[PDB]
């Protein structure tokens, strides 16, 4: 690694030292001659090394074998991949193969038909610390989609959505799932806790990247069975609901049902729902009349002192004061009481 | 379906035509399964024996394993699996019996054939003694796991102890590659002894007619060849489970005599790496759990080898704190022995062994403010990702907790108000107290109630120790403590507690006021932080 210009006659019998130490008997100093021969091949007959590096090994040389392949692969294409394909006919011995079709994939997109079968084996491996390797294999399926570019690709996204439904890294996988959908799902949302809200979060993400109006009528039945994390999911749901309202009578019923949910809150999630409702809809003053009575009891509890809820209620009172401009006398009196408070 | 249309047309050449079509159909229902089961009976009829060939008989096992890899369905399969496992079973036949036992494990996962397979395993274990005399066995390893799995899956009440008598009558006695292949059969016996280990300590008892049960283990840690590292890992986990139940632990103070449980069992460098934090933890809790039958030759051999892991910065971190906690809970046998001064000369080795761990903690502090081994090319394991600042605070917090309980046990080990506060210290023994005061002061540089809690633990260790020999420790380390007290004002709490309403107030205040009269001339000339500390 440091002195390739030392000599060349000593380079002739490196193999007389290194390949002699292949025939040892342990499992660590046998492997350590596979790595020191991978630095020498990667400078300037090389078939027998990398056909045995990916062979059936125990879980002892996990970090040991992987460093011997990553330093070998950029000279391998210089000197084809049937031997990686031949070991797929014979699990735990796949992850050594998977990590070399993970990093240097500039040439890997040649026969990707086995990569689709490996993507089918990726979901079989998804069913643990290898889940991070499976998410890396899930990112490899997005990478192979970025390397190759069928109907199995939509089926692979269905297993990836089920992998997200089985659950950080999944948020990055859901962002990768959003990019893959842009490049049965409503029935999967109807079939499915917090991951089902995340499945509802990905359903609105797939809806973004008319027909959305009739789907909102089905989603109104979905939102009726649903209405913190539920408030965060409804915040993404109201952004999908108001996007179709930005461009009929079904939208008035969904606004009235959420106003009934705002009446059911009168707890803080309805104020969070009303802030999202007033974010892109002009007329909400009818629900704001009982909400001002609820915010007056909320300001009385806030003045007696849930700091995030009181700040949101103050933001709700900030939104209600812009909308009110006939309880302006009682609202200004509580505002002066809040101004006189600590 | 389409798999039957491609296979009936394809019904060395046609075996490759059938196996590639079956592997593609497996990559792609019950009618094709029963049709392939009829084709499997014709495939297993021709050449059922092997004689390890490079011919289509191995490819016949490849298509048979392809039928095993895909999935009277179970009745005709188990009859065919028992028929293939009937011929060429108790000899070196092939690896097809491993695929047959795996198919039998898949069939049993979903009853009379299991009793016949256990009878076939018992006779093969009986014929294993004649095969061992022939070389004076890989199917025995596969039959050991499959039988246990089937028993766990269904019922095992009376036939389990019936095969255990065959397992009690198993192998117990004993070219270089053929001897290693015979040792590979002996390596199969260690995996077979894991089935003897799992039955003997899981839930209930068994046929207890066995007294050489430790003799079949302490022998097998010695003659196990160190090539296969995982063979010794499960053999260490065999003894890790047996030494957890109480009725089997009492058998060990026999002819082992706690003497063959040292580290001449971790032979190879491939086992020297990671099998040592396992080979140390099984003997640390076992020594703590017994605490009896210990001649003081053993008590010295256990207190020596388990502080040469504490001062070893090549093992780990969490196995250094495990090796410290052992010497803490071992004090109840060392202190409660006779007062021959062996209760004191053993406790000062441990206080030395904690002194030489606080010393290595202080070498790496300026390095935080040979530590570069990550630039080495051939990395031999997963590199550690833990930081240095949090765990060094965690090690010092734990080792100061263990240290106070040992120094309370120093209060009772006094030589002939004796044995209460006064004790005789030799000059070879007061020199290791001066390096405990010096390193505990210096290891508070890793800094506030958290560090002020350790200053209570540090000072209270030094209150109850012989105030004729406390006027000597604090006198030599007062010019050293004043130097650390300039850059750290938190260390001012230490002399504040040493005179706070205790038995040292009448002597420490006279030592301190002799010190500050010397620095009285050097008060008008120093800068602020030295003059602030001096009037404090």
TrEMBL record, chain A:
Q: Where are the transmembrane segments?
A: none
Superkingdom of the source species: Eukaryota
Q: State the family named in the UniProt similarity comment for this chain.
A: Belongs to the PI3/PI4-kinase family. TRA1 subfamily.
Q: What is this protein called?
A: Transcription-associated protein
Q: Which organism is it from?
A: Komagataella phaffii (strain GS115 / ATCC 20864)
High-level lineage: Eukaryota, Fungi, Dikarya, Ascomycota, Saccharomycotina
